[PDB]
């Protein structure tokens, strides 16, 4: 197994493998990103990326067909984008539109091209392209009152286009805010922006994360995770229908819940908690969620 001790001297907020599982990216309160090469059971530091002016909270890799590209977000309110060329790293872009911490950044389904979803404590959410062959322009929407802690893309899907009797794609994403709410957003060509589809109420305190399952199945799955110490699983039988709400388990968790992440096949849910344990979950025959493994080291 690969072990990396002391990637940073300060708190580590995120660590993420790229698509081929041969680069790891880590980020810290020390304001830096580090890129590790992972080949087999071995590892080495390739480069330390400096640029942010506050703790770096999260990073996300873009799909390999776009090349080797990382995005980072930070307390300093900036999103930085980094590219690897001929072995060496460098900074290729800056998204600086928000007036308070940027809490999450996430690459969209590769169907939309290199596109970023960005969420901030200033209450807003932004969506901006990455291009080296052209001019970008951010879409900025007011999302949540006290602030946005997380935003996550829904899978690319094609829907019926009534106005023209054809097919159009429906771009959705979900956000979680310090107002205890979860909201679904859908792009609207007429409004030229993302508009509010639904407001899902259920938590009794800040929502720290939301993750839209990449499930290839028809039903839609969202996991929301809160400081109320609960995890809500939201389902939707039909693209145009209501959202069902279900507690992952009936009783509060021991501490606050921080992150939630779906496996690629979309059936397994991994929760990161304040009790400093990661719990795996999946459905039984009756559709009730049950332990699917743990990591408590």
């Amino acid at each position: 197994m690969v072990v990396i001790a002391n990637a940073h001297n300060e708190l580590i907020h995120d660590a993420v493998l790229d698509y081929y599982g041969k680069r790891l990216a880590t980020c810290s309160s020390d304001k830096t990103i580090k890129i590790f090469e992972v080949e087999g059971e071995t590892h080495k530091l390739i480069d330390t990326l400096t640029g942010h002016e506050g703790p770096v909270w999260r990073v996300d890799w873009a799909h390999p067909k776009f090349g080797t590209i990382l995005a980072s977000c930070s307390y300093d309110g900036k999103v930085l984008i980094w590219k690897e060329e001929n072995g060496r790293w460098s900074q290729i872009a800056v998204h600086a539109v928000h007036s308070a911490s940027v809490n999450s950044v996430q690459w969209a389904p590769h169907e939309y091209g290199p596109l970023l979803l960005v969420a901030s404590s200033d209450g807003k959410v932004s969506v901006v392209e990455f291009k080296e062959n052209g001019t970008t322009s951010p879409i900025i929407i007011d999302a949540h009152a006290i602030g946005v802690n997380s935003a996550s893309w829904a899978p690319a899907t094609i829907e019926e286009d009534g106005e023209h009797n054809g097919t159009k794609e429906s771009r959705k994403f979900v956000t979680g805010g310090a107002d205890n709410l979860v909201k679904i957003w859908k792009y609207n060509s007429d409004a030229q922006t993302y508009v509010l589809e639904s407001t899902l109420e259920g938590h009794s305190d800040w929502v720290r994360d939301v993750a839209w399952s990449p499930t290839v199945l028809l039903r839609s799955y969202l996991a929301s995770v809160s400081q109320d110490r609960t995890c809500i699983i939201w389902t939707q039988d039909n693209e145009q229908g209501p959202w069902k709400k279900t507690l992952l388990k009936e009783e509060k968790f021991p501490d606050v819940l921080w992150r939630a992440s779906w496996s690629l096949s979309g059936n397994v849910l991994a929760l990161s908690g304040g009790d400093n344990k990661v719990t795996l979950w999946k459905e039984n025959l009756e559709g009730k969620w049950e332990p699917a493994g743990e990591v408590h080291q």
Binding site: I12, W258, R259, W262, V295
Partner: peptide, 14 residues
């Protein structure tokens, strides 16, 4: 300091 967990497309986990 909080836990961290991520799936990879390469059948690896972090």
């Amino acid at each position: 300091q909080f836990p961290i967990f991520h799936w990879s497309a390469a059948n690896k986990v972090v």
